[PDB]
């Protein structure tokens, strides 16, 4: 193929640039590949590129293996990681790019969390502050014990937001959280197809707040998702205020005020 190869090979060149030592190829081009697991370097991942390759949908993790496990089997397993890996792959499955930039995001966060059985120390912090493909999340807030994080995204009619949000609810980090809620509203400036209905999604306090939030901002077509998290005593008082500033930039950047 020509075009199909150019777009694909391009995303490949990038992932190949980001992970030159980690990612290996099994085929003549890239179609099928084997990328290793970063930081732990032992488990390798056998991935494929479907007829609906990442430009269309996303890659196809076929299986994962690990060299020198034995006792590691007690901690993790090939099929086990195979399942989580698939889930985090599915969680990025629908964006305009190959959703990869969102994918690494999954592994980077999920790989270290839940190591053993202990209390979450203040030596770790995973507050979302970087943007995603199709997805733009960077607006967290800190509270007593709790953690607030909102993910924003500029979207057309339901088919767009509905999918990208569906999947964000099928997202692993959203599931690692305590509760997640979302608010959306579709405005048809040209047509009359407006989807008007939100929900509490769990915490009515935030659901309504977001509703008021988008209402007062007077911006439609954009979605937002608030997730809750618990870590440390207050995490860091400085996060709240400084990340507030960062948050305002995120939301604004996500098309709220653009």
From Swiss-Prot:
<dbReference type="GO" id="GO:0003785">
    <property type="term" value="F:actin monomer binding"/>
</dbReference>
<dbReference type="GO" id="GO:0034198">
    <property type="term" value="P:cellular response to amino acid starvation"/>
</dbReference>
<dbReference type="Pfam" id="PF01205">
    <property type="entry name" value="UPF0029"/>
</dbReference>
<dbReference type="GO" id="GO:0043022">
    <property type="term" value="F:ribosome binding"/>
</dbReference>
<keyword id="KW-0539">Nucleus</keyword>
<dbReference type="GO" id="GO:0006446">
    <property type="term" value="P:regulation of translational initiation"/>
</dbReference>
<dbReference type="GO" id="GO:0033673">
    <property type="term" value="P:negative regulation of kinase activity"/>
</dbReference>
<dbReference type="GO" id="GO:0001933">
    <property type="term" value="P:negative regulation of protein phosphorylation"/>
</dbReference>
<dbReference type="InterPro" id="IPR036956">
    <property type="entry name" value="Impact_N_sf"/>
</dbReference>
<dbReference type="InterPro" id="IPR020569">
    <property type="entry name" value="UPF0029_Impact_CS"/>
</dbReference>
<dbReference type="GO" id="GO:0140469">
    <property type="term" value="P:GCN2-mediated signaling"/>
</dbReference>
<dbReference type="InterPro" id="IPR020568">
    <property type="entry name" value="Ribosomal_Su5_D2-typ_SF"/>
</dbReference>
<feature type="cross-link" description="Glycyl lysine isopeptide (Lys-Gly) (interchain with G-Cter in ubiquitin)">
    <location>
        <position position="187"/>
    </location>
</feature>
<dbReference type="GO" id="GO:0004860">
    <property type="term" value="F:protein kinase inhibitor activity"/>
</dbReference>
<dbReference type="InterPro" id="IPR023582">
    <property type="entry name" value="Impact"/>
</dbReference>
<comment type="similarity">
    <text>Belongs to the IMPACT family.</text>
</comment>
<keyword id="KW-0810">Translation regulation</keyword>
<keyword id="KW-0963">Cytoplasm</keyword>
<keyword id="KW-1017">Isopeptide bond</keyword>
<dbReference type="InterPro" id="IPR016135">
    <property type="entry name" value="UBQ-conjugating_enzyme/RWD"/>
</dbReference>
<comment type="function">
    <text>Translational regulator that ensures constant high levels of translation under amino acid starvation. Plays a role as a negative regulator of the GCN2 kinase activity; impairs GCN1-mediated GCN2 activation, and hence GCN2-mediated eIF-2-alpha phosphorylation in amino acid-starved cells and subsequent down-regulation of protein synthesis. In normal conditions, it resides in a actin complex and has no activity.</text>
</comment>
<comment type="subunit">
    <text>Interacts (via N-terminus) with GCN1 (via C-terminus); this interaction reduces the GCN1-GCN20 complex formation and prevents the interaction of GCN1 with GCN2 protein kinase and GCN2 activation in amino acid-starved cells. Interacts (via C-terminus) with ACT1; this interaction occurs in a GCN1-independent manner. Interacts with RPL39; this interaction occurs in a GCN1-independent manner. Associates (via middle region) with ribosomes; this association occurs in a GCN1-independent manner and persists under amino acid starvation conditions.</text>
</comment>
<dbReference type="Pfam" id="PF05773">
    <property type="entry name" value="RWD"/>
</dbReference>
<keyword id="KW-0009">Actin-binding</keyword>
<protein>
    <recommendedName>
        <fullName>Protein IMPACT homolog</fullName>
    </recommendedName>
</protein>
<feature type="domain" description="RWD">
    <location>
        <begin position="10"/>
        <end position="114"/>
    </location>
</feature>
<keyword id="KW-0832">Ubl conjugation</keyword>
<keyword id="KW-0346">Stress response</keyword>
<dbReference type="InterPro" id="IPR006575">
    <property type="entry name" value="RWD_dom"/>
</dbReference>
<dbReference type="GO" id="GO:0005634">
    <property type="term" value="C:nucleus"/>
</dbReference>
<dbReference type="InterPro" id="IPR001498">
    <property type="entry name" value="Impact_N"/>
</dbReference>
<keyword id="KW-0678">Repressor</keyword>
<dbReference type="GO" id="GO:0005737">
    <property type="term" value="C:cytoplasm"/>
</dbReference>
<dbReference type="GO" id="GO:0031333">
    <property type="term" value="P:negative regulation of protein-containing complex assembly"/>
</dbReference>
